Each structure stands twice: as C-alpha cells, then as structure tokens.
Amino acid sequence: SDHKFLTQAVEEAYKGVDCGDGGPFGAVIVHNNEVVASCHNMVLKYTDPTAHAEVTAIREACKKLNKIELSECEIYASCEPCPMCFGAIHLSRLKRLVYGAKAEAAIAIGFDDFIADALRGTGVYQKSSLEIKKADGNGAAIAEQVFQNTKEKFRLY
Amino acid sequence: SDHKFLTQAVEEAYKGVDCGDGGPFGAVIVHNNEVVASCHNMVLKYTDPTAHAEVTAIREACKKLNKIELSECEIYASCEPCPMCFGAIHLSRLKRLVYGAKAEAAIAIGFDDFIADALRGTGVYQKSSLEIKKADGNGAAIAEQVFQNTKEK
Ligand SMILES: [Zn+2]
Ligand SMILES: [Zn+2]
C-alpha cells in the first residue's frame, strides 16, 4: 500500500511542475486506505511561499474532515519535508509520514539547503514523535529520479 | 517603532483569542514603517492547524505585495515563532524578526513544548539567516502578560 500512495505523490509532483503550479513536490494524505487529499506544491499558483505540497494537503484534508487534527491519517511526501512542512505535520498530529527522496536529491538540482533537524533527529529543542519511514526499493528510486528528470525537461528553457 | 509594531501584534493576539478565531498569538508584517499585514492565529476559524499568526500574516502580506518573497519586510510576533512558522519565515525571506515572549511563557500556561532550534541558534541542518531580536523591557513584559491574562479565556 505504501508504494501505491508514494507513487501517487510522485505523479502529483510531475503534474504540478508540468502545469506551473509550483516545484516538483507532491503529497497525499490517506485515512485507512482512503485518499483524503492529493496535492502538489502551489507556491506559484497561489503566490504563497507556505503552499508547499504537504501544507496544501494538510489544509485540504482538515477542511474536508472538519477538524484540525489528522491523527488517524498518514501522509506520503514525494520528497523529504522541509522544516516548515515537518512542523505543520507535527501540528496536524498526522500519525505517520512516508517520504520518497532524501532532501539531497532536490538540493542536487539547486533547491535550497533547508532540512528539518527534527526529522533527522538532530535537534536540541525540537523532537519528533510520529512514525517516519524513508521509502526503499522501487518507490524510492522513482521518487529520487523526479529532480534530475525535471531539470532535464527544463534544461534548454 | 519596534515597540509599536510588537504591541500591535500583541493586540492582535488578544483580539483573536477574544473572538474565538484561535489562540492568543499575533503577528504584524511591515514594509519599513507601513503595516503590510496584521493578523492573529486563525486555526479555529479556518479549521487549519497551519494558520498560526505568522503563517497567516505571511500569506496576507504576499497577497498584498503580489509576490512570494518579502525581503524588504520585517515581522513582529507576539510569541517566539514555532518550527513551522520559523520555517515559513525562512522561506518568505523576511529580513528581520522581532518577537515578544519566549516560548516558555506559552508553555507555562499549557501550550505544547514546540521550539525552533534554528531560531535559538542550535540547529544543525537548519541555519537562520535573518536578524532576530527578542524583545526586552516593556515589550517583553507586555508580550509575556498575554498568557497570564488569557488563561481562562
Ligand atoms: Zn515544505
Ligand atoms: Zn507557529
């Protein structure tokens, strides 16, 4: 099941960058195998620097479910969530995070060096409690290739 | 001026908690000396756990200026911004943050221990770039008093 939803997140990333909504990032929020929200980065479309894929999905899922906690839901992120997004995942009380590519894969094509200490377990003040799964196998390889694929698609533009 | 805009962020904190929009937290974004956004926590009003005062203010300022970066603006927060909000402040590229109450003041009234390493200078992977000012004196007194004053609210 993890492979299904992670690949849905990756496809959101491709769709969002293709239509110009934002960068190549996707996120899917799922409640007992039912998809609650399927989003990509909307920073450009919304003129909102907080509209990352994860934040957008959280906003949508909370509005759909009429509550500010998503404690029975899980989130699939095509890329490792940044500090803002990991903070939003913490605040939302999501029970599990599965992510596809390490942040280094995005930094490799020029994205900002902007990594969540609490995700990687390197903080003094901020600690995480939720279950975190870095994908492996086919899902991880597919997720990691998003960034070189996007850079190649826009190389001569 | 620093006192003026921090006091306005505290005023937003009180207004928001009084009308049930969210918790006792406010934020003000200014371009030199003009208010670009003045907001409070809207978590309850919007059913949105990301709608902290700072995030709400960033979104409104970016809409007002029609752009996703706020490198000419500064942000005043009634309370120390949390990891989410400090991340948002980084992404928006605000050039300066002034905040009134240390997170311990909110925690002492029963809010979650949820503190940004990058703001306190203890981040390993996340390093702040912007200038940060913790208020002192009367500004700190005003911002700390919010939590005692709104305890039963
Ligand atoms: Zn993010
Ligand atoms: Zn916050």
UniProtKB/Swiss-Prot annotation, chain B:
Q: What did gene disruption experiments reveal? A: No visible phenotyper under normal growth conditions.
Spell out the family assignment given in the record's similarity comment: Belongs to the cytidine and deoxycytidylate deaminase family.
Alphabetically, the GO molecular function entries are: guanosine deaminase activity; zinc ion binding
Q: In which tissues is it expressed?
A: Expressed in roots, leaves, flowers and siliques.
Name under which the protein is recorded: Guanosine deaminase
Keywords of the record? Cytoplasm, Hydrolase, Metal-binding, Nucleus, Zinc
Q: May I have one GO cellular component term?
A: nucleus
Q: Does the keyword Transmembrane apply?
A: no
- What function does the entry list? Catalyzes the hydrolytic deamination of guanosine, producing xanthosine and ammonia. Deaminates exclusively guanosine and 2'-deoxyguanosine but no other aminated purines, pyrimidines, or pterines. Deamination of guanosine by GSDA is the only source of xanthosine production in Arabidopsis.
**Transmembrane regions listed in the UniProt entry:** none
Subcellular localization, per the record?
Cytoplasm; Nucleus
Task: Give the EC number.
Answer: 3.5.4.15
Is Transferase tagged as a keyword? no
Task: Tell me the superkingdom of the source.
Answer: Eukaryota
User: Biological process GO annotation list?
Assistant: purine nucleoside catabolic process
Q: Where is the active site?
A: 54 (proton donor)
- Ranges for domain CMP/dCMP-type deaminase come to 1-114
- Which residues are noted in the entry as Zn(2+)-binding? 52, 82, 85
